[PDB]
Amino acid sequence: VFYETFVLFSKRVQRADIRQLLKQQEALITKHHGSMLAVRDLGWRKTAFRVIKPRQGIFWFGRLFYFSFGANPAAITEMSQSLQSTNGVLRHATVRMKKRHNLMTYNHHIHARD
Amino acid sequence: HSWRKLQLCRLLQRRPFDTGSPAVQLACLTEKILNVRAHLLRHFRDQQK
Amino acid sequence: MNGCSKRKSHRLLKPVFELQQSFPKIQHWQGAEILHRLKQKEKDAAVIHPCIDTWGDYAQCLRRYPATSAARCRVESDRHTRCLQQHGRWKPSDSLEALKLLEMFKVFNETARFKYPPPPVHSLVRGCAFPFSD
């Protein structure tokens, strides 16, 4: 089963932290028999509102990352719990990849008709 | 579950695409009953099932 | 040379008194209450006169201020001037109520206490007896 995960790291997060988190996620995928498909960086984006992350602070933007992976359905709960426990991550969401409207295929001309 | 039902069909089918013959229907209904019984053992609070 | 060859009779060009949308018939008393609410919210200006209230306010302000009225009463003066200029040639409206106008269109539903009048016969009957023989 294919899935896409979107993460929003804070400014305090570093490249080393991102690499560590991705390594942990790939370890979970391999444990659940899956395989990481792709990883991409969607740039720095301002939040629609200030994120008050308790015991971490207040943030006004974040760096957005995306990774797509095929894995057994049982891995999603573990991945979600791990991402929630991670400190730097501000927000995360994992969804089932769709045939047409997915970042792997429907990745260009999402706003420009011509 | 679909793979297991396909295997039972290939075992008990009249021809390659026969899925409605009463033998194949019996096999598929048995498989579905077993799957729902397992699902109920897990989600014992799912009353509609 | 080229141009329209038929009359420009489109009801958009020539708006007509009609309801362009139908609706399931409404209970007569419920419709009457809704129309009363609409009229109250609109505040149909059937008062003694639009200028009467402005004149009353102006006179009251003058009475309250007998010395510095020249400077005090200016908003009231401008309002009264506007009212005189706008509703000076004001005539009270003479039209049927929207309730009757919609009873004409048969919007409402006959209840126990409301029935549409039967078609007139005495007024509409026209008879012409002529010889027909030979």
């Binding site: - | - | 007509v16 309801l19 129309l35």
Partner: protein, 92 residues
């Protein structure tokens, strides 16, 4: 959310009226009154049924009154059913 209005080259009374209109069309007072006190589920069922039955009638009668006012203002006459087979030809 909270509506923000800028009182610039206008009357504070007019701006307050616009704010009141926003509140009325958003049902803010209705929700505040609802949450000020407990509403039992059956009462809510009855209220929602009543509203869903009532408001379309009000909208239709509002449209009818708008048409009546327009016709009175423009001195429009009652329509006659369009007779078919009329050539609709210009008298020119």
């Amino acid at each position: 959310m909270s509506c923000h209005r800028h009182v610039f080259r206008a009357a504070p009374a007019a701006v307050f009226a616009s704010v009141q209109r926003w509140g009325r069309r958003n049902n803010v007072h209705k929700l505040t009154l609802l949450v000020q006190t407990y509403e039992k589920p059956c009462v809510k069922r009855t209220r929602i049924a009543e509203e869903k039955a009532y408001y379309p009638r009000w909208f239709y009668l509002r449209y009818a009154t708008e048409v009546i006012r327009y016709s009175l203002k423009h001195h429009l006459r009652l329509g006659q059913a369009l007779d078919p087979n009329d050539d609709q030809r210009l008298d020119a």
